[PDB]
Amino acid sequence: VKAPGFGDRRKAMLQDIATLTGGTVISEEIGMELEKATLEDLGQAKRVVINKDTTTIIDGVGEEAAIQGRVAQIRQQIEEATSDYDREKLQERVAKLAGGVAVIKVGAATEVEMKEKKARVEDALHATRAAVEEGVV
Amino acid sequence: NIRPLHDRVIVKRKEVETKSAGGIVLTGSAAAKSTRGEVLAVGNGRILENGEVKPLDVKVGDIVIFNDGYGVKSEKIDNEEVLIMSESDILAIVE
Amino acid sequence: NIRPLHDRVIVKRKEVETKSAGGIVLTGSAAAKSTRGEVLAVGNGRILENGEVKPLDVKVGDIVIFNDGYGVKSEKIDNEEVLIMSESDILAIVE
Amino acid sequence: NIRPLHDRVIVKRKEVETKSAGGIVLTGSAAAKSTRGEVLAVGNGRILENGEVKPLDVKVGDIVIFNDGYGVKSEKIDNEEVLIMSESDILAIVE
Amino acid sequence: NIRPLHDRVIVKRKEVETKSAGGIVLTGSAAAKSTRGEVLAVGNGRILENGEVKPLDVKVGDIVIFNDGYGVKSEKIDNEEVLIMSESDILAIVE
């Protein structure tokens, strides 16, 4: 499969996968060669499923301390972010490493109803996040 | 075993050193391929114009410095890289 | 039968191995043409400047390592690929 | 200790002078590398066609002027750069 | 003092004339470099195939005409430019 991400985000994704599966990334700029790779440099998992579009890793073998440290570093990088796109991407990374990703698909007969119901659902999601964050009156 | 013909010598290239004049580690194109090897097989000798043959000056077991070029060939014997190359490309003998 | 002239030798290239250092099958440009062959016919010998002829050092039945190049030529005899090539291109004799 | 083979000579080129015809300091590409060196080791000699070997005309200890080329090779021995190059590239002997 | 080796000759290139066939002064690329020189040092002689050495025909003190080429080298000795080049590039001897 191909490595997700373009540029430094590909590095972030690969390093996160290595931490989750307990492996080591083989790269030129760190000082190792692919011919010198051994069993220790390969990560371990329980189930891996690939299809036409998506790849998932199930039950990665890794000590929780590494994941906690990595998500702490990612949270620290989040705290010093300006753009909304960057904070969204780093929050997605936190969800991948620590929690999960949930998708709500709106159903409607036509397109105008689709758009309005989607807007209402987005407003409800934002309001629920704010209410969880700061409380209600 | 493998024996050469005429004035060809089989050598095993030395491992490339990683530390140079201290603990600094060299990785990449800075560390070039070693120009030193141990002689493994030596042929009978070059054939002169008259017809007689003269034995080579180099002996098996010594370390020699050779000039890699077009005449130097790399072959896989005993699952190991060896160099089959002419005696004229041997430059000097260490010790 | 076919016999060469002077210092030319008939060899037959060995089949390229499909598995190397294990059961992994190698297919594509990685599997290069084998540099080992079986000698079939050997000529009388090279002609020296003075006039006499010296026999070759290689004998029919041995396994030799040769360099593919411009001098080496492929010829179709008796529905079988064989190589016509000079003795000076032979590098070493196995066993 | 390192000894050459046939007609190869081990030399150590002199340091490039900085002051030329006075106190004017020459720095950059104007100061060409020295073409003078000190011979360190000398091989047995060239091998003639008939078979006997003739000693070199250059002895260890003298200063020689050599012409750099493709055959001149630079190697690191005793953590010191030396030049391995054929006797035919020696032009003249100083004093 | 500097002595050559084998069949090399030390010559001193003569100054290019400024006036040609009259008082007209020639300046620029029209005035070609002089092809005449004064021999300074002559080596022992070219080595033969058998092993004997034959002395050069040119003697120190004569004026010779030589052709400039890749084998001709210019060296700085005694703060004076000299040419180190093989005897084969000598074309003729004046007087």
Q: Which residues, including other chains, have CB under 8 Å from residue D6's CB and lie 6 or more apart? A: B57, D43, D44, D45, D46, D47
Picking from B70, B75, B62, B74, the residue whose alpha carbon sits closest to that of residue B89 is: B70
Q: Å resolution of this model?
A: 3.1
By the 10 Å C-beta count (0-12 exposed, 13-18 middle, 19+ buried), B79 is classed as exposed
CB E44 to CB D57 under 8 A?
Answer: yes
Torsions phi, psi for A9 (to 5 deg): -65, -30
Chain C: residue whose CA lies nearest to B8? C91
For residues E5 and D90, the answer to whether their CB atoms sit within 8 Å is: yes
Chains A and D are touching, with contact defined as 3 or more CB–CB pairs separated by less than 8 Å: no
Residues of E in contact with D54 (CB under 8 A): 47, 51
| Distance from the first to the final alpha carbon of chain A | 50
Q: Do C50 and B50 touch (CB under 8 A)?
A: yes
Which helix (DSSP H) or strand (DSSP E) does residue C13 occupy? strand C8-13
Min Cα distance B85 → chain C (Å) is: 8
In angstroms, the separation between the Cα of residue B4 and the nearest Cα of chain C is 4
CA closest to D8 among chain B residues: B91
Contact yes or no for C62/C44 (Cβ under 8 A)? no
Nearest to B83 by CA among B93, B74, B91, B92: B74
Q: What are phi and psi of B18, to 5 degrees?
A: -100, -30
D89 DSSP assignment: G
User: Which residues of chain B are at the D interface, by a Cβ-Cβ cutoff of 8 Å?
Assistant: 21, 35, 48-50, 52, 54, 57-58, 65, 67, 90-95
Amino acid at B19: K
Give DSSP secondary structure letters for C43-75: -S-EEPSSS-EE--S--TT-EEEE--SSS-EEE
Residues of B with Cβ-Cβ distance to D8 under 8 angstroms: 91-92
Chain D environment of E2 (Cβ under 8 Å): 65, 92-95
- Contact criterion met (CB < 8 Å) for D93 and E1: no
Q: Which residues of A68-88 are buried (b: 16+ CB within 10 A; e: fewer)?
A: eebbeebeeebeeeeeeeeee
Identify which of D48, D54, D92 has the shortest CB distance to residue E84.
D92
Residues of chain B positioned with their CB less than 8 A from the CB of D84: 65, 91-92
Helix (H, G, I), strand (E, B) or coil at E89: helix
- In CATH, the architecture of B1-95 is Roll (2.30)
Contacting residues of E for D35, CB less than 8 Å apart:
75
Neighbours of chain E (3+ CB pairs under 8 A): D
Chain C neighbors of B41, CB-CB under 8 A: 92
Amino acid identity of D89? D
What does the angle CA A55 – CA A59 – CA A61 come to, to the nearest 5 degrees? Answer: 110
Strand, coil or helix: A21: helix
- How many other β-carbons are positioned within 10 Å of the β-carbon of residue B87? 21
| Span between the terminal Cα atoms of chain C, in Å | 27
Which chains are within 8 Å of D by 3+ CB pairs? B, E
- What are the residues whose beta carbons fall under 8 Å from the beta carbon of B51, sequence distance 6 or more? C48, C50, C52, C54
Closest residue by Cα to residue E91 from E61, E56, E71, E67: E67
Decide if B57 and D10 are in contact by the 8 Å CB cutoff.
Answer: no
B76: closest chain C residue by CA: C35
Contact D/B (≥3 CB pairs under 8 Å): yes
Residue E52 identity: E
Name the experiment that determined this structure: cryo-EM
Of B48, B54, B92, the CB nearest to D84: B92
**What is the interface size between B and C, counted as CB pairs within 8 Å?**
40
Supply D77's token pair: 């021995």
Q: Is B92 within 8 Å of D10 when comparing Cβ atoms?
A: yes
Q: Which of B87, B4, B60 is nearest to C92 (CA)?
A: B4
Sign of torsion over alpha carbons B56, B59, B64, B66: positive
Lookup: tokens for B57: 């000056």
User: Backbone phi, then psi, for A108, in 5-degree steps?
Assistant: -160, 155
Contact B58 D5 (CB under 8 A): yes
Neighbors of chain A by Cβ distance (3+ pairs < 8 Å): none
- Chain B residue numbers touching C52 (CB-CB < 8 A): 51
Closest partner residue to C91 among B1, B8, B79, by Cβ?
Answer: B8
For residues C37 and C73, give the distance between their C-alpha atoms in angstroms, rounded to a whole number: 14
- Partners of C58 on chain B (C-beta within 8 Å) are 5
Phi-psi region of D78 (alpha: psi -120 to 50; beta: other; left: phi over 0): left
Which residue in chain E is spatially nearest to D53 when comparing CA positions? Answer: E51
Q: How far apart are CA D34 and CA B83, in angstroms?
A: 35
Neighbours of chain C (3+ CB pairs under 8 A): B
Per DSSP, E48 falls in state: P
CA atoms of D82 and D37, how far apart (whole Å): 10
